[PDB]
Enzyme design. Structure first.
Site, PDB file in Angstrom:
ATOM      1  N   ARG A 116     -10.482  -4.035  -0.046  1.00  0.00           N
ATOM      2  CA  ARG A 116      -9.239  -4.652   0.369  1.00  0.00           C
ATOM      3  C   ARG A 116      -8.715  -3.891   1.552  1.00  0.00           C
ATOM      4  O   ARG A 116      -8.477  -2.681   1.471  1.00  0.00           O
ATOM      5  CB  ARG A 116      -8.226  -4.649  -0.788  1.00  0.00           C
ATOM      6  CG  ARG A 116      -8.602  -5.653  -1.869  1.00  0.00           C
ATOM      7  CD  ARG A 116      -7.606  -5.815  -2.987  1.00  0.00           C
ATOM      8  NE  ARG A 116      -6.590  -6.779  -2.602  1.00  0.00           N
ATOM      9  CZ  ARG A 116      -5.419  -6.425  -2.110  1.00  0.00           C
ATOM     10  NH1 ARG A 116      -5.142  -5.122  -1.979  1.00  0.00           N
ATOM     11  NH2 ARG A 116      -4.520  -7.356  -1.766  1.00  0.00           N
TER      12      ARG A 116
ATOM     13  N   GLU B 155       3.512  -5.521  -1.327  1.00  0.00           N
ATOM     14  CA  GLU B 155       4.722  -4.834  -1.794  1.00  0.00           C
ATOM     15  C   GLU B 155       5.963  -5.163  -0.997  1.00  0.00           C
ATOM     16  O   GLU B 155       6.560  -4.269  -0.406  1.00  0.00           O
ATOM     17  CB  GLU B 155       4.510  -3.322  -1.821  1.00  0.00           C
ATOM     18  CG  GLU B 155       3.499  -2.868  -2.850  1.00  0.00           C
ATOM     19  CD  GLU B 155       3.545  -1.375  -3.134  1.00  0.00           C
ATOM     20  OE1 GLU B 155       2.560  -0.887  -3.718  1.00  0.00           O
ATOM     21  OE2 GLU B 155       4.536  -0.685  -2.787  1.00  0.00           O
TER      22      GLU B 155
ATOM     23  N   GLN C 245      -2.342   3.183   7.603  1.00  0.00           N
ATOM     24  CA  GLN C 245      -2.670   4.422   6.918  1.00  0.00           C
ATOM     25  C   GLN C 245      -4.048   4.975   7.292  1.00  0.00           C
ATOM     26  O   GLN C 245      -4.290   6.160   7.093  1.00  0.00           O
ATOM     27  CB  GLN C 245      -2.585   4.258   5.400  1.00  0.00           C
ATOM     28  CG  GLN C 245      -1.243   3.871   4.869  1.00  0.00           C
ATOM     29  CD  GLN C 245      -1.226   3.857   3.349  1.00  0.00           C
ATOM     30  OE1 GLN C 245      -0.880   4.865   2.718  1.00  0.00           O
ATOM     31  NE2 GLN C 245      -1.584   2.712   2.754  1.00  0.00           N
TER      32      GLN C 245
ATOM     33  N   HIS D 276       0.843  -5.448   5.793  1.00  0.00           N
ATOM     34  CA  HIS D 276       1.144  -4.232   5.043  1.00  0.00           C
ATOM     35  C   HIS D 276       2.096  -3.343   5.879  1.00  0.00           C
ATOM     36  O   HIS D 276       1.722  -2.227   6.295  1.00  0.00           O
ATOM     37  CB  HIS D 276      -0.158  -3.515   4.665  1.00  0.00           C
ATOM     38  CG  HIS D 276       0.001  -2.461   3.613  1.00  0.00           C
ATOM     39  ND1 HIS D 276      -0.872  -2.337   2.552  1.00  0.00           N
ATOM     40  CD2 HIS D 276       0.913  -1.473   3.468  1.00  0.00           C
ATOM     41  CE1 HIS D 276      -0.507  -1.312   1.804  1.00  0.00           C
ATOM     42  NE2 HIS D 276       0.579  -0.779   2.329  1.00  0.00           N
TER      43      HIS D 276
ATOM     44  N   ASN E  86       0.429  -4.094  -8.399  1.00  0.00           N
ATOM     45  CA  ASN E  86       0.304  -2.693  -8.051  1.00  0.00           C
ATOM     46  C   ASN E  86       1.105  -1.874  -9.034  1.00  0.00           C
ATOM     47  O   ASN E  86       2.300  -2.070  -9.185  1.00  0.00           O
ATOM     48  CB  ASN E  86       0.824  -2.457  -6.631  1.00  0.00           C
ATOM     49  CG  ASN E  86      -0.074  -3.078  -5.537  1.00  0.00           C
ATOM     50  OD1 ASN E  86      -1.066  -3.769  -5.795  1.00  0.00           O
ATOM     51  ND2 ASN E  86       0.295  -2.812  -4.296  1.00  0.00           N
TER      52      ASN E  86
ATOM     53  N   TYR F 153       1.759   2.156 -10.807  1.00  0.00           N
ATOM     54  CA  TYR F 153       1.600   3.608 -10.771  1.00  0.00           C
ATOM     55  C   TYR F 153       2.195   4.331 -11.976  1.00  0.00           C
ATOM     56  O   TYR F 153       1.643   5.318 -12.464  1.00  0.00           O
ATOM     57  CB  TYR F 153       2.176   4.158  -9.458  1.00  0.00           C
ATOM     58  CG  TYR F 153       1.274   3.838  -8.300  1.00  0.00           C
ATOM     59  CD1 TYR F 153       1.471   2.676  -7.545  1.00  0.00           C
ATOM     60  CD2 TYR F 153       0.187   4.653  -7.990  1.00  0.00           C
ATOM     61  CE1 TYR F 153       0.634   2.345  -6.492  1.00  0.00           C
ATOM     62  CE2 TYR F 153      -0.666   4.331  -6.927  1.00  0.00           C
ATOM     63  CZ  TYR F 153      -0.428   3.174  -6.188  1.00  0.00           C
ATOM     64  OH  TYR F 153      -1.244   2.828  -5.149  1.00  0.00           O
TER      65      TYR F 153
ATOM     66  N   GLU G 210      -3.693  -2.474  -6.896  1.00  0.00           N
ATOM     67  CA  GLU G 210      -3.544  -1.054  -6.625  1.00  0.00           C
ATOM     68  C   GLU G 210      -3.347  -0.319  -7.936  1.00  0.00           C
ATOM     69  O   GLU G 210      -2.402  -0.585  -8.678  1.00  0.00           O
ATOM     70  CB  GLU G 210      -2.345  -0.777  -5.714  1.00  0.00           C
ATOM     71  CG  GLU G 210      -2.522  -1.081  -4.233  1.00  0.00           C
ATOM     72  CD  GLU G 210      -1.452  -0.429  -3.349  1.00  0.00           C
ATOM     73  OE1 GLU G 210      -1.365  -0.810  -2.160  1.00  0.00           O
ATOM     74  OE2 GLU G 210      -0.694   0.463  -3.827  1.00  0.00           O
TER      75      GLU G 210
END
Lengths: 466, 467, 467
Positions: free
Chosen positions: B79, B171, B21, B125, B307, B309, B375
């Site tokens: 991280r 994830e 990313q 990742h 993580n 959201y 996250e």
């Protein structure tokens, strides 16, 4: 079914770009801001995708590779423009000359010549130093004349010993109209919600362009032409205007449409006065020339560069510059378009429009020397397709073939066209359209800046070699 | 109305990013291609705006300035993840180790430490070396375990003398589901028009992730942990699942939803076997563990990173796929009333209390000794056509982190051992199938120019950490 | 007959300079033009010798050697200013942040600290980005407040982790008066033949300075002070005003003179309103504060820096302008007898006791918790045609600082909390409308070659600080 041998021996085959669309490095090497940096950063809503010329296509750093690609295409000459505020960051001489700026242009010129490509230079392609826009309203003030003249003289002195073709202004109509009638281009004046007056300011602006053009031309003729053995012209743009029907009203409409788009500039440069349609319809809103300005404007150019893209039918309309010529333009006759509609809905492919416009110009203004300084076609910037697919621009090749054939027809019929320049060489920034479309024969990745030749670049290469 | 003093002394406050990313330079310093390079270049239609990680946000060239921005924020730890194919361009050892790759990571690590920022590292990742995908289907093959193990051992050896926190996978649910059930993420298998089987491949994939995870953890524990004095874990994601009504059906549905998203991984790591709802519903399509793997999986992590959201209501459901195997309908509405304020893509709703519930549930259900919130963050539209002046002022994001931190604190006071919290992402970066149409950063990044600028949220975090 | 032991332990001894007077490199590292570039290039007749700050004294390229000279002097702290347009070439954020600019300041700061010299920073010493002048008249528009605030916030963020002393404005009186009443300083408005209105514009200008100052101070206090552990103030200038005779008229005149030069700023900062003599004499031409601005202005500074050069007698006075709005005639003579020894330009007279009186008056009248003497120094003619050997021997300047330091000490012993003293200027530099016809430095600078050489005064200061 058009080859190189159909053209005179000395005809020039080229391509071009402009500083703000190509260079990037807007805040490097001590460049001062132009009105296009301003327009684009202060009001990104005015651009289709909010984008800007900050990095543009990064030509300022990538010139050596660019010129390598020009040579691989067989370009005989490259038309490029100098960023006025890159060499003079405050527009005027008192704000100082930028040495990093002049080094770049010298390096660019020298590298072109080292590759057998002839540099052709435009002083003004819309990127007025923001300093002068702020000091006195740019081309809204007669003050622009002298400053444009020092800038011109500087350039002639600094670079002119290796350049044979100088252009003062590119598309003064598009500048004046889009910038001061529509508010679509920098400085964004004249439209709904904008700051100017579309009935006044477009006419003040071209009046001042014409006077500024004239001063640069005298400067060149009197002090540089004999030494440097080059020529200065101006480049004008026009659509072709075809009468919708054959009634007199539509032939008169054609006269007016042509008068207001092209005659606005060409008439002053021929008889030292504006078209009579303009004089009669615009009255006190059209500035007059002093006897001395009038006289000196006559034949005040060495060539006229011509920019052509499309043609439109034209009839009688049923205060602003846009409505002063009393002419309705439409692209259809009986629901049948004048030519194939390209992406965007404006540009229609009408090759025969170039023929007619070139003949019209000859017949009406008796211009000794013409060029087609910009000819080309708009393609949608499709994200979501491969380079392998995007590359295959068959339609652009066809477009250039058909237009070249119209140029040749015009030469055969007596018009002294001396060269043809593909616009643009590269995919670049597209002003209010940002990066939603592509005009180049060289593909450019708008983020990575990677260059790749399109099929049309390979056709051009073959064409020039014949 | 939450301050630093509300959290234990040793709690870590940080942020993060991932290789693909952020790094860019996909074809520089001799990096080998990953499945995310492939996916995005071979299938740009699969991405919201046809974009890719080719330049990403250019972290690979701009790391010195990035770390300067981390310290201005007061980051205590960062991280990041190692691009497997940046260090091993062919994934396997025989294809060779890339010196430019290892120099980068060494320079990145040293630079963090020189600024008082603790490096914490994720091995995987999602950017699996394309070489491995092609040789044997990547995680579709048990061959992945040994190669992942070599890769892990190499990292522990090369970098582990200066890193105290290792993550194996980030994830694995999102990777297996988006990649092999929906065909939304690389390698783009399992959906309509795609190549795999959404009933089979998602389960084969996480079975091998768990087995690979296990090998890396043993490698670390047996050969590196005593020397290097660090810890390895894994990072899991879940939504919180709220029963839509209070009927049995809905409580059972929540158990299933949680089991299939979180239990899929956590249960093997707890009792060495899959959730019972999974075994019963998926049957022969869920692979079994050998007696020996079963036993070694138990407690096979030093921490679980979490993580989070959003949360969703959950109810009984009305083509064989993992997506429909838990028989659970998910919805964000009760009686036309959303579970919390809907954010930009229509998916993430702001539900701070979901973090609290998810953390409590995790403790209660799997008795995990050590948790982190690895996250936590919020989605903002990438509005082109507004000034930086305006885009900077992300009051909503500050509010978001304040409310979520309160939830984390609530959970700590209630007995769950959460030991740190990491804002995601530190920078605006590439967003997988969404490309560059949204922002998650506390640092603004111009997606063309790469210019960095702090958002107001970055200034709140700076002050919060300093308390 | 004054020594270091006469001052409290923590008192700071320093010197200073400003961006435009010292930096040079006006068109390098991508600096945008300031109104001082414009003024000096468009109107060189307005300058005593037609000169400009184009090269100034070349501090921007010579900073490593400059800081070496600071340490040889024993400077404990150096006061410098950031060129707003060197970091933001268009003043606004949308025009972009200049990386070469921020690197310079970072290198300057780090270099000071590496030599044990404390950086203390002024955001605004008159060099307003030309962009802002042109877009909306600069300080003539309330638009200046937000842009100044962004600029301040940017600096606090970028540099504030290493600076403990921030100044918002230097000499707002001199800026507003010379710039909008006399037309002597950029932007050259208000005098005969000039563009503005000396009755209107001086007051609009300082109204907006005060409002801009206030925003920067809140920004710092709310978002940076707790983290960075520094303080923000403003720096004011005044002459001392002595009543010419002892008649009432002359005591009232002194109150007015002080009110209009100093009270103009200090009173808003004390009671959130202008001096009463101003309100009464200027009426509708003095803008009002909103209730909310009024209240927030009260005590809206951490310290007041004081700049002092001279004193003048004062009496009742006999075209509408700020200059004649206080009805006060100023003169340097009593009965043909000057108030103190007249120095080079006929303006600065040496009156050490004026500093004492001005400091006592400031305390008594505005009860300012913390004071500094941020500028104190003396004017020497730039004699071309003498040797360095001779020009070096500035006995007069040493005497000057000794006498003034005694005055400062007197004031401290008498209860005024003066916490530091800064020689102005450290180097010979550009002198605004006087160009290069005089010198203020303790370090000699050749105005062409840029060669630096210590004056005897620099050697006295070195010894004094070391005591």
């Amino acid at each position: 079914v058009v080859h190189r041998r159909d053209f005179p021996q000395d005809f020039i085959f080229g391509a071009g770009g402009s500083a703000y669309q190509c260079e990037g490095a807007y805040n490097e090497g001590n460049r001062g801001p132009s009105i296009w940096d301003t327009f684009t950063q202060r009001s990104p809503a005015k651009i289709s995708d909010g984008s800007n010329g900050n990095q543009a296509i990064n030509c300022y750093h990538m010139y050596k590779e660019d010129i390598k690609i020009m040579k691989q295409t067989g370009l005989e000459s490259y038309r490029f423009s100098i960023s006025w505020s890159r060499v003079l960051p405050g527009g005027r001489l008192a704000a100082g000359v930028n040495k990093d700026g002049v080094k770049f242009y010298h390096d660019f010129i020298d590298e072109l010549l080292a590759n057998g490509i002839k540099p052709s230079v435009t002083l003004f392609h819309w990127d007025l130093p923001q300093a002068l826009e702020d000091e006195y309203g740019g081309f809204l003030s007669h003050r622009i004349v002298d400053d444009f003249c020092e800038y011109a003289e500087f350039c002639f002195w600094e670079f002119g010993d290796k350049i044979k073709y100088w252009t003062t202004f590119n598309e003064p109509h598009t500048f004046a109209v889009n910038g001061y009638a529509l508010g679509e281009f920098a400085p964004g004046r004249g439209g709904k919600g904008d700051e100017g007056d579309p009935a006044i300011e477009p006419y003040v602006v071209t009046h001042n362009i014409l006077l500024a053009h004239k001063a640069a031309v005298e400067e060149y003729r009197n002090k540089f032409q004999k030494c440097q053995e080059g020529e200065i012209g101006i480049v004008l743009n026009s659509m072709w205007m075809e009468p919708l029907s054959d009634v007199q009203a539509d032939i008169d409409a054609q006269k007016r449409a042509l008068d207001f788009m092209l005659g606005w500039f060409l008439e002053p440069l021929t008889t030292g006065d504006y078209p009579k349609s303009m004089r009669e319809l615009v009255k006190g809103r059209l500035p007059k020339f002093s006897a001395d300005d009038s006289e000196k404007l006559k034949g005040c150019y060495d060539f006229i560069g011509m920019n052509y893209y499309t043609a439109t039918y034209v009839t009688n309309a049923v205060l602003s510059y846009e409505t002063d010529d009393q002419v309705t333009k439409t692209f259809e006759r009986n629901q049948k378009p004048i030519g194939h509609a390209l992406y965007g809905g404006w540009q229609h492919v009408v090759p025969w429009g170039l023929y007619k416009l070139l003949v019209y110009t000859k017949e009406t203004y008796h211009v000794p020397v013409l060029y087609v300084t910009e000819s080309g076609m708009v393609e949608e910037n499709k994200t979501k397709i491969l380079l392998s697919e995007a590359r295959r621009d068959a339609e652009r090749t066809d477009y250039h073939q058909k237009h070249l054939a119209s140029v040749r027809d015009a030469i055969d019929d007596g018009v002294n066209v001396k060269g043809y320049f593909v616009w643009s060489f590269f995919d670049n920034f597209e002003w209010n359209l940002g990066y939603i479309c592509r005009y180049g024969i060289i593909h450019v990745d708008y983020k990575s800046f990677e260059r790749y030749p399109k099929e049309s670049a390979i056709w051009y290469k073959n064409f020039i070699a014949g």
